[PDB]
């Protein structure tokens, strides 16, 4: 469903800020930062082609740590994203990759949820008062120079010191049950079109730490989509806590090292990885989020009070009605229909998954979340001659159309530059 494109504008980084879709802006609870030039590429969704020194206090220096410090699966370049055509490339890449996602029926579905996925207005200490949470906002510099507060859902931002960072260390005392309480909060995705990962086409090698160089290339659109499915659990508040984890007995090598994997990661991947979330336990999650919804439904029915935007009590009321699929009765009251809850739930946690996105994209991809990366490559998907919205790297009317030759790296070698090999380097 890309008949009308997701980004309707041709964007280049150098364009004069208008204070609307191209504006210096500031993110919440950084009062420090110099305003940053950002771009609104679609309603509720913004893009910040700078590397992220902001959101988290801990990083904020892109300098590489000592080499005795660094783990093999880390990669550091302090100069990346520093120039203009670079940030120009970034906008162009991120844009395409959305359009790609958006031309699949799955992508169209998903993205619609993400737009509709507005963070609940929970800010008030007063239970009968409707209050938007201000962490859910950005602050944008209007053409006059005055600040305007603007509510959003998603931000695509450049990386941090570690470009390939495969896990977050970031989040701890941040008060965000917003992701597990059904509220949702505005998600911040760190992402680079300009890099992607090597992997092996055979299961026995791919799940082996000691074997292979990464013959094939992950399609960044599969990568972006993945964070977007994460983002969707975390906009609706149905995300699973990171400390729920699977101690891995499915792999000798993982198990040897006591590596654990968060249920949220297994769910996000989907496929045959989802049975490793215990059906027993999963129903517990279900009932929880189903009850979490009954709380949002209640809170909605109590509230006679708002904090004025232009918006009335009943306009926003219907916005969250739509978001959670609520059932109103003759008396004007909201409830949670147990059918539509499971509808919504099945959709986010099951229908939208990395596995299925691989189905739509007609691409080669890692068969399981539990596997061992081989390489990281530098890429450029901006030239149409490298990469397209419809065919990705495997380009129709070329020798790369068939047998996944576009992702084939010894064939398309023109299109990739290896940076690191992770093989053998793993902690074993």
């Amino acid at each position: 469903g890309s008949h009308m494109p997701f980004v309707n504008k041709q964007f280049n980084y150098k364009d004069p800020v208008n204070g609307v879709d191209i504006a210096y802006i500031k993110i919440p609870n950084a009062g420090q930062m110099q305003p940053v030039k950002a771009f609104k590429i679609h309603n509720k969704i913004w893009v910040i082609p700078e590397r992220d020194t902001f959101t988290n206090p801990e990083e904020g220096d892109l300098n590489p740590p000592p080499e005795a410090k660094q783990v093999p699966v880390s990669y550091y370049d302090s100069t990346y994203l520093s120039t203009d055509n670079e940030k120009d490339n970034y906008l162009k890449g991120v844009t395409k990759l959305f359009e790609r996602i958006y031309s699949t029926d799955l992508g169209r579905m998903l993205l619609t949820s993400i737009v509709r996925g507005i963070p609940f207005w929970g800010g008030s200490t007063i239970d009968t008062e409707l209050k938007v949470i201000d962490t859910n906002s950005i602050n944008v510099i209007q053409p006059d120079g005055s600040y305007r507060s603007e509510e959003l859902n998603l931000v695509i931002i450049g990386p941090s010191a570690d470009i390939i960072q495969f896990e977050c260390k970031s989040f701890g005392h941040e008060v965000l049950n917003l992701t597990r309480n059904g509220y949702g909060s505005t998600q911040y995705i760190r992402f680079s079109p300009d890099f992607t990962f090597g992997f092996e086409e055979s299961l026995e090698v791919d799940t082996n730490p000691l074997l292979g160089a990464g013959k094939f290339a992950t399609d960044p659109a599969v990568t972006l989509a993945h964070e977007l499915i994460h983002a969707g659990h975390r906009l609706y508040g149905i995300a699973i806590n990171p400390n729920r984890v699977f101690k891995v007995n499915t792999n000798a090598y993982y198990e040897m090292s006591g590596l654990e994997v968060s249920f949220e990661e297994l769910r996000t991947f989907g496929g045959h990885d989802a049975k490793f979330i215990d059906s027993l336990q999963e129903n517990e999650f279900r009932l929880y989020y189903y009850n979490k919804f009954k709380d949002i439904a209640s809170t909605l029915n109590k509230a006679k009070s708002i904090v004025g935007t232009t918006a009335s009590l009943q306009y926003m009321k219907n916005v969250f009605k739509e978001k959670y699929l609520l059932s109103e009765d003759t008396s004007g009251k909201f409830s949670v229909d147990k059918l539509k809850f499971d509808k919504l739930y099945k959709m986010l946690t099951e229908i939208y998954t990395e596995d299925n996105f691989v189905k739509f994209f007609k691409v080669l991809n890692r068969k399981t979340y539990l596997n061992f990366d081989k390489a990281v490559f530098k890429i450029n998907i901006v030239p149409k001659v490298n990469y397209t919205i419809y065919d990705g790297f495997n380009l129709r009317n070329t020798n790369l159309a068939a047998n996944f030759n576009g992702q084939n790296t010894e064939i398309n070698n023109m299109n990739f530059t290896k940076l690191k090999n992770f093989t053998g380097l793993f902690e074993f």
Partner: peptide, 5 residues
């Protein structure tokens, strides 16, 4: 954030 190892 995450892709994992």
């Amino acid at each position: 954030x995450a892709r994992g190892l």
